[PDB]
């Protein structure tokens, strides 16, 4: 393998210890600490999941009874289960906030490539693990999730020759499927730790809390000066989350989304398809499937979202040609009388207003997409929510199209002002 | 030719003391001899912090925190100047809200309106008369 030149860092215990004992971190704010929160939540997820594994027997017909009985006879088991669920929630929250923050700072440059992609891959893997975890609940929610995943897997093969059997045996949750998925969940959850370590090592090459290049050269020593601040910011965000959850969720509630988790596989055969809803983090994808009734187009939308999320630095980056790359433009060619356009250069973050407007439109579209369930019972018979379609289409356009990111208007206007001023002053 | 460079080119060559125990006779090479190979990550993990920085005639002074305020420049002035005017108008609005108030407001209003239209269609579906 001569094509592979090498590795940025050799993750040996000696060198890792030295690197983390000599690491320096520049002064930062809370917005640039979501990565540490994600990593700490990953560590707690590892610990709590290890504790849970010693209680969960992978037989589907015993998981509900085992969970119910081992919460009483054993102390702290239900505490660890609650910690695991809330850790998944906070892990999704921190990961998406980190993604939004890194999209905001325009980290699609070439020097960020290794930092960016290594992160996205981790995120991608972090998705798969979550899916497997859901299956372990052995509720009707797990049944529906497994069925949808099996249908998506079988989509690639045109429904020929049961290529899904090695994992989704019969497309149903049984002893074999549960055992295999639980073991894969454990192994990939532990692999996520190594992936996160690799990403954290890579990203330190060019780390910035803000886009503006502060001239400071002195930096904090990571072990305690930065670590204490990271832990404190984690504490503050956890306090805020506790307050919001305490007030937004009354102790007894009516019509929660957990009501679909009543049905346990095996015990209850009939499924209340009227109220089918996943956890909020997988809510956007189920909403997309409901909005796009076409199976192939929905699968393509999911794959495109994830992969374009992976390939941001390539579409929007400098591309090593130093902004001499030529785009393909539909209509601007007529206005400029040129087939192609040189990539614009001045695309700062804090200063320009177009970038902020587009980014916040994208973020609000994502929030609206996760805001509710389209309720496919008559979501199409009734003309569907136009806001959901607008938000999905803007998400697709923002990720992939370079006219909403690095727009040409700013560069042309700045050059016009430059030309006018130089002509006036010669 | 029998020359190191073959007699027609110059070779930047160096015999590393790594993998060698003795300088000569029976005395060991210095423990940190390998560090004398500049610009190699293998030499030290300190080379990862290698951003461009050059200076001449530059002096900076730093003081021990033991001689400095535990909480410096806290509540200088009143609540109005330190909190209402600085942390809210200059830190929350000038930096954060001034940037996203318009797009967030537009998206929020549009989502509210679209959800209301969707709910009204749902009502028409469920309720007649």
């Amino acid at each position: 393998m001569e094509w592979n030149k090498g590795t940025y860092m050799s993750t040996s215990i000696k060198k890792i210890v030295q690197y983390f004992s000599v690491m320096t971190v520049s002064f930062h704010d809370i917005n640039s600490l979501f990565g540490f929160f994600t990593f700490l939540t990953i560590a707690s997820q590892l610990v709590s999941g290890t504790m849970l594994a010693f209680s969960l027997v992978p037989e589907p017909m015993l998981i509900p009874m085992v969970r119910e009985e081992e919460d009483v006879e054993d102390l702290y088991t239900d505490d660890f289960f609650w910690l695991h669920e809330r850790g998944v929630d906070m892990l999704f929250i921190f990961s998406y906030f980190h993604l939004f923050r890194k999209i905001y700072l325009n980290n699609f440059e070439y020097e960020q490539e290794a930092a960016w992609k290594s992160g996205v891959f981790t995120f991608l893997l972090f998705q798969v693990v979550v899916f497997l975890g859901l299956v372990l609940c052995c509720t009707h929610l797990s049944d529906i999730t497994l069925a949808i995943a099996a249908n998506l897997y079988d989509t690639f093969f045109a429904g020929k020759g049961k290529f899904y059997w090695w994992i989704f045996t019969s497309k149903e949750l049984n002893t074999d499927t549960i055992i295999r998925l639980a073991y894969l969940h454990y192994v990939l959850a532990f692999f996520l730790a190594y992936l996160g370590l690799i990403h954290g090592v890579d990203m330190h090459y060019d780390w910035k809390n803000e886009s503006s290049m502060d001239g400071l050269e002195t930096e904090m020593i990571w072990f305690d000066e930065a670590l204490s601040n990271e832990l404190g910011a984690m504490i503050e965000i956890i306090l805020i989350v506790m307050i919001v959850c305490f007030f937004m969720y009354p102790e007894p509630e009516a019509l929660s989304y957990e009501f679909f988790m009543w049905g346990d596989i095996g015990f209850i055969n009939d499924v209340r398809f009227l109220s089918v809803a996943p956890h909020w983090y997988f809510r956007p994808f189920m909403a997309w499937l409901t909005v796009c009734p076409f199976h192939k187009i929905g699968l393509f939308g999911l794959i495109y979202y994830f992969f374009i999320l992976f390939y941001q630095p390539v579409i929007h980056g400098t591309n090593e040609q130093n902004n001499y790359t030529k785009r393909n433009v539909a209509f601007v060619s007529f206005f400029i009388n040129r087939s192609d356009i040189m990539t614009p250069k001045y695309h700062s973050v804090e200063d320009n207003l177009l970038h902020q407007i587009t980014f916040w439109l994208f973020l609000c579209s994502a929030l609206y997409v996760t805001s509710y369930l389209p309720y496919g019972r008559f979501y199409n018979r009734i003309n569907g929510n136009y806001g959901t379609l607008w938000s999905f289409m803007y998400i697709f356009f923002y990720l992939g199209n370079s006219f909403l990111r690095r727009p040409l208007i700013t560069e042309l206007y700045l050059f016009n002002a430059f030309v006018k001023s130089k002509f006036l002053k010669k | 030719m029998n020359v190191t460079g073959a007699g027609l080119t110059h070779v930047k060559d160096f015999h590393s003391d790594e993998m060698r125990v003795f300088r000569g006779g029976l005395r060991h090479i210095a423990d940190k001899q390998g560090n004398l190979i500049y610009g190699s990550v293998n030499s030290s993990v300190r080379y990862y912090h290698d951003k461009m920085s050059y200076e001449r005639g530059f002096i900076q002074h730093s003081r021990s925190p033991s001689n400095q305020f535990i909480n410096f420049h806290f509540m200088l002035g009143g609540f109005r100047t330190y909190v209402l005017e600085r942390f809210f108008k200059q830190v929350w609005y000038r930096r954060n809200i001034r940037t996203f108030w318009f797009p967030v407001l537009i998206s929020y209003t549009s989502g509210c309106i679209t959800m209301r239209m969707y709910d009204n269609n749902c009502y028409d579906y469920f309720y007649f008369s």
Binding site: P250, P252, E253, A254, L255, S256, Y257, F259, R272, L274, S275, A277, Y368, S371, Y372, L373, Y375, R377 | Y108, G111, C112, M115, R116, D119, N120, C122, Y123, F126
Partner: peptide, 30 residues
């Protein structure tokens, strides 16, 4: 973002529209 309060879905949770579900929690406090 804003969910109508007479559809029969509490806080936007669709389904359960053939039931009386808001009694004691949202309308009335047992």
């Amino acid at each position: 973002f804003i969910y109508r309060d007479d559809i029969g879905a509490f806080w936007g949770i669709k389904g359960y529209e053939e039931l009386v579900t808001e009694v004691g929690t949202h309308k009335g406090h047992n």
